[PDB]
Design a protein around this nucleic acid. Structure first.
Length: 98
DNA sequence: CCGAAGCGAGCACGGTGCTTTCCACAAGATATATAAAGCCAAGAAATCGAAATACTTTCAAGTTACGGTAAGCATAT
């Protein structure tokens, strides 16, 4: 069975109280009868730390270097930017050249 | 007719511990025939497994309609 949007709060609370070291004990103390890998995916999907914030200037240098080094025609491989630049997903990163 | 010289020679060398070509004619070989019985054995007909050239669905990617605050400039008091 899927979640009911009521266990992620206690999950992140226990993860912050323990230090995000061992997710197995966290899942066992949470009492969901599910594997740690099955709940960690939804935890990271509901987490906000995976995203980014207002754009700086020093990262523009790296983006321009990566473009001038591995861009082809009118297509830009933003997946390479996701691989190199941490924090940027594939959805909202394309705006960096839109 | 004896004499010299080769010359071939029996004689010794210790104790022990077979193939094929024909007359012999007396058997063999090949010949049906039931007849029950299961199996082996090659030629078709039916059946099923592997899969490739196709269809559904999943999944990555960018471009899409729709804001979230924030900053430079006009004009009233």
């Amino acid at each position: 069975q899927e979640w009911s949007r009521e266990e992620e709060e206690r999950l992140q609370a226990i993860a912050a109280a323990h230090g995000h070291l061992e997710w197995q004990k966290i899942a066992e103390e949470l009492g969901t009868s599910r594997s740690a890998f099955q709940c960690l995916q939804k935890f990271q999907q509901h987490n906000k730390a995976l995203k980014r914030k207002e754009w700086t200037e020093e990262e523009d240098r790296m983006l321009t270097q990566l473009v001038q080094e591995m861009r082809v025609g009118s297509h830009i491989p933003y997946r390479r930017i996701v691989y190199y630049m941490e924090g940027r997903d594939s959805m909202q990163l394309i705006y960096r050249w839109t």
